[PDB]
Write a protein that binds this ligand. Structure first.
Ligand SMILES: [Ca+2]
Ligand SMILES: [Ca+2]
Length: 1203
RNA sequence: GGGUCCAU
RNA sequence: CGAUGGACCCA
């Protein structure tokens, strides 16, 4: 308390400089009211210039247009909140007119007449505002598009109206074209990227003209892309700008486009390890019924809401208790989640998307500077987003003398609150220091508490999610005999007690009914507790009167609505969303609870375009009702993909596209493309010839041709693709060929598993003198396994892993394969497995019923090569339902060892290392799962596993040959665990060969049969695999080639050399579009055709029906039509700002389903779920509907991006 | 429920 | 009258 207080406000509310920066500029001016101003003048630039240490990342970009002089300014600050201020507008708006009138295309000239004022702000504000770049465009007719204030473009043209340069300014604002004409490139960038990326596949072998032609035709792209001309138009992506710009009386002279903060690095702004790094430096001197209240700190980027957020974590572990970068701390009764609102629109992305909103805000200002000019933007990020209540912590008060000064700061930050209809007068304000709290000063520590216990009394208890009215997202309807109508869904809020009246409201005239009951897969509880996955039973209502989407709420709770007001964010390009902006006519589907729904929208007053990244407010009207109320999140999806999220603000009042086009493809599709000869065999022969390689002369050669393993990769890439392309072909005419070769083989497996099941139960050679590498690895192996696995299979596991999928069983068949048919029909069951089946029967009230009980499985024939079929077993159903328990847990466990069976990727990623480092090897085994004898399986597994494993397996089988066998192998492929087992047996077996050879076990990675282990192991792993039964396939195990292959990918020294096969005789136009696409993928290098093969492609393209030669698709979208450029595609009907292309699809007729089976499969699955960008939590899994494939094809219109 | 690739 | 798992594509 030094000089005066009252007439210091006068010093503040004159310049607007920090408070103490005022009482102390009077603490050096004897009390001179007008001197005070000057001393702060020439003392503010020491501020602003030791301010340059704060990066200027955010800001605004300005544009002005006079007759035909335009200028695009790009002054910027360092915060959303400044860049939208009242004051930051004044400056960078007036500086924009100093470039207009006086045309100042020079940047230094204006960063000079203003540097006086460029501190009359920073002093008042507190962010490094550096006026960045200026420059202007002289045009004869030019226009500008202004996108928020974030991205600005300037396009001067000629002969074009406003309705042109607007658009072509909007194209420039949504397609960052760094050039104006395809022929604008300097032979630097062009002989950079053309004599750099010439060796690229010139080293790949590909000879001169090829790499020459590819590279070149690639730069034809590397240019058209970045250039206004060959750049698909943005408001009509069919024609490029250069073909729109020509169709009119116009031509772009040039364009300038600035984006608020490009080039500027801006290094990440974490929080936890930011706060924790503050908290763990001043650390140096039963009850889950606790609510979770989300709070965020919001304030000025330097009043240390980072410190004040540390004081609430320290002082709160020093006393009481103890998404995406939020810091939790605990309180005697509640549980908090603290954010830091660091950017206005950077936050609305969060509350909207649903990430983490705020149940209560906390405004950190420092009493040293008072409220800030951009404080209001903070408080206006308040009103504008919902945050219920706002708490105000006044930081750094010791640094203030006179107390009447403080009661003047409040004075202000109460009167800003109440310009934003927040309760200003009745809002709480704590005065205290953050840094001192850390230090340890308890006269201050009680303030960080005085605040904490304000969060304990001003932000009220959030309404328990199980306490609000009833509501439950109906996701599937069933008509069971004796239950009538039942819906199943995860009850979202409230309780439904059996007997109560629920009202089914949503899509049609809302209906009434009454709760007959509620059941899970096991219990039958008389109520539904929100958060549970139950089915709820209804009386007196037909099942064609409900649909997915509707909810089942207590009556009056929620009403159907069609039009409303919202705020939605649009998934940026890199977040897997759209990548072309859209405009006035967006027409998507809106995913609500369990169903899409189409709907049109209207942008607000003045916005005309919208783009990836934007988060626009918009009014939406749907094609028909949903049950909706304020605070209901919804995704925005376009055929499959999620491209935007968003919530509902207020719920309003409310009450080309050709066909005999689609018609023409339907028919062409069903054409049987016809030609003489083995088509395929021609495509192959012609393809070989295209690469100076001699074709097959008989189809007899097609698969008796062995590659050469030495040659330039190109000389080999082509060659492997020769030895493999026609290797799986079925329609192979001549050839004394059969599936009975397949059995013969299958029939050896046994003889082998005898030979080895027998002498593997005889670990007594003769003596004790000598020792065997085999007998040893089993001993290591066995132990290792037991530590990974256990005594026996867990039941908290055997439970969370036993499911019912796949097609056929000894009692079902492809026709009735889908799970609900397994729950409907009485499934088989092996004798030994009977005890489990009942265990289940005792676990549920549903009729787990076992049909015929037997020890047999059916051994059959799925096709494999051109010279042999595969030998399978259709298990008895109920065995399978359990075989999947231990197949499943064997998975989860095989994870510790490093093996991930859910990802053929880690295992083919390495296949590639191998081929380059020549250290890893890849090993193939022959009849993989067929040689695992019980012997080797017994002395290797725990005896509790080895039973639960004997129990569930099929011990006998019946062949088509009429006869039987008594499996010598522990398990046939077909078996439910046979995979995760061979994985584990193989893996362990190799890991042991690792230890005995002193090699880092962890270098062994296995996938069923595909083992990859350190190359030294391969002779031992081979001598072992010998001894223990398996037979190690020389011709397809590599430990030295330039070549490895693993999990479908092959490789020749870093280069991919994975071929493709033309498995069956090609007759359908679908069947062609495949080979043709597979071809395309195998010789494209990111769009550019290797020419050699582009030859044989085009030639065969011509075999296809006219319309279909021209109907093309982006890659990664199937084979319902030739992969090509989707813009060219003519039957590409654009609709509602979302492209739609037509793809062929195998035709289907709806079929009857079993209402129990599915109802049981749905509840049972819901039980399964319970013992097992960031907004895909608005996406469930869909109902059960069945259909048999017909012989026909059908044209399906699907959604689409621009690449 | 239908695909393509893929390990058995 | 086509087993079991991946991984993605439609639905
Ligand atoms: Ca293999
Ligand atoms: Ca094999």
């Amino acid at each position: 308390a030094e000089i005066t207080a009252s007439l210091v406000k006068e010093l503040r509310e004159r310049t607007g400089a920090g408070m103490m920066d005022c009482k102390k500029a009077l603490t050096e001016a004897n009390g001179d009211i007008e001197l005070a101003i000057e001393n702060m003048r020439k003392s503010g630039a020491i501020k602003a210039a030791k301010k340059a240490g704060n990066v200027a990342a955010d800001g605004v970009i300005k544009t002005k247009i006079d007759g035909n002089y335009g200028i695009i300014l790009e002054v910027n600050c360092q915060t959303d909140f400044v860049a939208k201020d009242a004051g930051f507008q004044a400056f960078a708006d007036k500086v924009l007119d100093a470039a207009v009138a006086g045309k100042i295309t020079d940047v230094e000239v204006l960063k000079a007449q203003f540097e006086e004022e460029r501190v009359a702000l920073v002093a008042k504000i507190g962010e490094n505002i550096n006026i960045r770049r200026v420059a202007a465009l002289e045009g004869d007719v030019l226009g500008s598009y202004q996108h928020g204030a974030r991205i600005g473009v300037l396009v001067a043209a000629k002969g074009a109206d406003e309705e042109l340069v607007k658009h072509i300014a909007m194209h420039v604002a949504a397609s960052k074209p760094e050039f104006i004409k395809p022929e604008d490139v300097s032979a630097e960038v062009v002989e950079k990227e053309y004599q750099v990326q010439l060796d690229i596949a010139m080293q790949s072998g590909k000879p001169k003209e090829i790499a020459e032609k590819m590279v070149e035709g690639r730069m034809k792209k590397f240019t058209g892309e970045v250039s206004l001309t060959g750049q698909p138009f943005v408001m009509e992506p069919s024609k490029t700008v250069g073909q729109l710009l020509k169709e009119h009386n116009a031509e772009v002279t040039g364009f300038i486009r600035f984006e608020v903060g490009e080039g500027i690095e801006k290094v990440e702004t974490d929080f936890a390890a930011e706060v924790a790094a503050m908290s763990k430096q001043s650390h140096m001197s039963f009850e889950r019924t606790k609510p979770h209240v989300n709070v965020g700190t919001i304030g000025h980027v330097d009043h240390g809401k980072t410190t004040l957020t540390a004081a609430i974590t320290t002082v709160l572990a020093k006393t009481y208790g103890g998404n995406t970068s939020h810091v939790e701390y605990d309180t005697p009764t509640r549980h908090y989640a603290h954010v830091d609102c660091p950017g206005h629109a950077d936050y609305v992305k969060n509350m909207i998307t649903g990430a983490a909103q705020m149940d209560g805000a906390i405004l950190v200002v420092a009493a040293t500077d008072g409220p800030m000019p951009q404080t209001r933007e903070h408080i206006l990020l308040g009103r504008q987003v919902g945050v219920p209540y706002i708490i105000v912590f006044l930081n750094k008060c010791d640094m203030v003398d006179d107390e009447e000064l403080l009661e003047l700061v409040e004075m202000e930050v109460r009167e800003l609150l109440s310009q934003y209809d927040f309760p200003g007068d009745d809002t709480p304000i704590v005065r205290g220091s953050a840094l001192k709290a850390l230090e340890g000063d308890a006269e201050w520590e009680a303030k960080i508490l005085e605040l904490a216990g304000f969060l304990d009394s001003y932000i009220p208890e959030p309404e328990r999610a199980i306490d609000k009215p009833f509501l439950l997202p109906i996701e599937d309807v069933f008509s069971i005999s004796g239950r009538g109508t039942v819906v199943t869904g995860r009850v979202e809020r409230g309780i439904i007690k059996v007997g109560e009246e629920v009202e089914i409201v949503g899509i049609k005239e809302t209906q009434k009914s009454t709760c007959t009951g509620v059941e899970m897969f096991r219990k039958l509880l008389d109520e539904g507790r929100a958060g549970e996955n139950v089915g709820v039973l209804l009386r007196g209502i037909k099942r064609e009167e409900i649909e997915r989407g509707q909810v089942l709420a207590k009556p009056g709770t929620i009403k159907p609505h069609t039009k409303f007001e919202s705020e939605v964010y649009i998934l940026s390009k890199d977040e897997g969303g759209r990548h072309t902006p859209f405009f006035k006519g967006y027409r998507p589907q809106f995913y609500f609870r369990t169903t899409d729904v189409t709907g049109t929208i209207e942008l607000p007053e003045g916005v005309e375009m919208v783009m990836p990244g934007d988060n626009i407010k918009m009014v939406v009207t749907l094609i028909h009702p949903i049950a909706m109320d304020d605070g209901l999140r919804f995704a925005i999806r376009e055929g499959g993909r999620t491209v935007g999220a968003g919530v509902v603000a207020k719920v309003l009042s409310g009450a080309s596209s050709r066909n005999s086009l689609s018609a023409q493809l339907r028919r062409a599709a069903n054409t049987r493309i016809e030609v003489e000869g083995n088509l395929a065999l021609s495509i192959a022969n012609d393809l070989l010839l295209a690469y100076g390689q001699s074709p097959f002369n008989s189809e007899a050669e097609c698969i008796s041709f062995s590659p050469r393993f030495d040659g330039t990769p190109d000389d080999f890439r082509i060659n492997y693709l020769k030895a493999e392309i026609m290797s799986k072909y079925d329609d192979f005419s001549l050839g004394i060929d059969t599936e009975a070769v397949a059995w013969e083989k299958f029939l050896a497996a046994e003889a082998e598993c005898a030979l080895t099941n027998a002498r593997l139960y005889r670990p007594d050679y003769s003596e004790d003198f000598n020792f065997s590498l085999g007998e040893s690895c089993i001993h290591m192996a066995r132990r290792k396994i037991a530590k990974l696995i256990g005594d026996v299979p867990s039941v908290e596991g055997m439970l969370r892993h036993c499911r019912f999928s796949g097609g056929a069983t000894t009692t079902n068949n492809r026709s009735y394969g889908h799970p609900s048919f397994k729950f409907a029909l009485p499934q088989a069951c092996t004798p030994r497995a009977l005890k489990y089946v009942l265990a289940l029967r005792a676990s549920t009230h549903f009729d787990i019923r076992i049909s015929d009980i037997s020890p047999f499985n059916k051994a059959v024939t799925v096709p494999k090569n051109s010279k042999t079929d595969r030998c399978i077993a259709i298990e008895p159903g109920w065995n399978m339902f359990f075989q999947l328990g231990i197949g499943g847990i064997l998975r989860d466990r095989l994870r510790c060892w490093g093996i991930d069976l859910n990802d053929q990727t880690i295992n083919q990623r390495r296949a590639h290392e191998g081929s380059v480092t020549n250290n890893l090897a890849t090993v193939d085994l022959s009849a993989a799962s067929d040689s695992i004898s019980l012997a080797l399986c017994e002395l290797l597994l725990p005896p509790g596993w080895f039973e639960v494993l004997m129990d569930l397996r099929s011990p006998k089988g019946r062949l088509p040959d009429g006869s039987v066998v008594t499996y010598e192998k522990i398990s046939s492929m077909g078996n439910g665990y046979t995979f995760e087992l061979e994985s584990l047996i193989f893996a362990s077996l190799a890991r042991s060969v690792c230890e005995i050879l002193d090699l880092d076990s962890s270098e062994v990675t296995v996938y069923g049969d595909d083992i990859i282990l350190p190359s030294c192991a391969v002779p031992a792993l081979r001598e072992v695999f010998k001894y223990v039964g398996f037979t190690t396939n020389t011709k397809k195990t590599f430990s030295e080639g330039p070549f490895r292959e693993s999990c479908g990918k092959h490789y020749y020294s870093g280069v991919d050399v994975t071929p493709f096969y033309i498995r069956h005789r090609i007759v359908s136009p679908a069947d062609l579009i495949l080979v043709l696409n597979n071809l395309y993928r195998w010789a494209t290098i990111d769009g550019v055709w290797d020419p050699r093969a582009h030859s044989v492609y085009l030639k065969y393209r011509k075999l296809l029906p006219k319309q279909l030669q021209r109907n093309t698709i982006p890659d990664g979208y199937g084979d319902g039509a030739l992969v090509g450029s989707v813009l060219i595609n003519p039957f590409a009907k654009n609709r509602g700002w979302i492209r739609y292309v037509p793809v062929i699809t195998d035709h289907t007729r709806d079929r009857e389903r079993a209402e129990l089976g599915s109802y049981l499969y749905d509840l049972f699955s819901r039980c399964l779920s319970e013992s097992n960008a960031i907004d895909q939590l608005i996406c469930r899994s869909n109902p059960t509907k069945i259909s048999r494939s017909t012989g026909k094809f059908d044209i399906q219109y699907i959604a689409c991006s621009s690449r």
